[PDB]
Amino acid sequence: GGTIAKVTGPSTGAVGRNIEFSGKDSKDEDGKIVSYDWDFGDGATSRGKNSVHAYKKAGTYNVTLKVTDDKGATATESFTIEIKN
Numbered sequence: 001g002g003t004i005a006k007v008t009g010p011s012t013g014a015v016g017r018n019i020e021f022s023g024k025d026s027k028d029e030d031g032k033i034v035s036y037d038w039d040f041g042d043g044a045t046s047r048g049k050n051s052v053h054a055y056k057k058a059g060t061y062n063v064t065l066k067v068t069d070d071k072g073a074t075a076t077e078s079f080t081i082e083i084k085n
Contacts, residue, residue, distance in 0.1 A: 001083040003028045005077035012082050014059055019078040019081070021065075023049045026077075028069040041081075055083045 006025035041061030
């Protein structure tokens with residue numbers, strides 16, 4: 001009930017194009033979020049509230065964001081993106 005991850009991005013994209021994802025709307029109800037860990041669903045990862053990824057192959061990818069708060073609690077949320085050739 002405290003901390004929530006939120007993922008903002010496009011539901012579709014194209015192979016080879018840089019796609020911007022944001023965690024900006026993530027929240028700790030009683031403190032601050034200190035880190036943003038992304039997994040783009042193709043083995044790639046990144047850190048930072050606003051992160052970027054290009055997919056190398058068509059597919060449907062489940063992007064996850066794990067946020068950590070200033071109490072060390074974590075929360076994860078998912079976002080599905082369909083990448084066409």
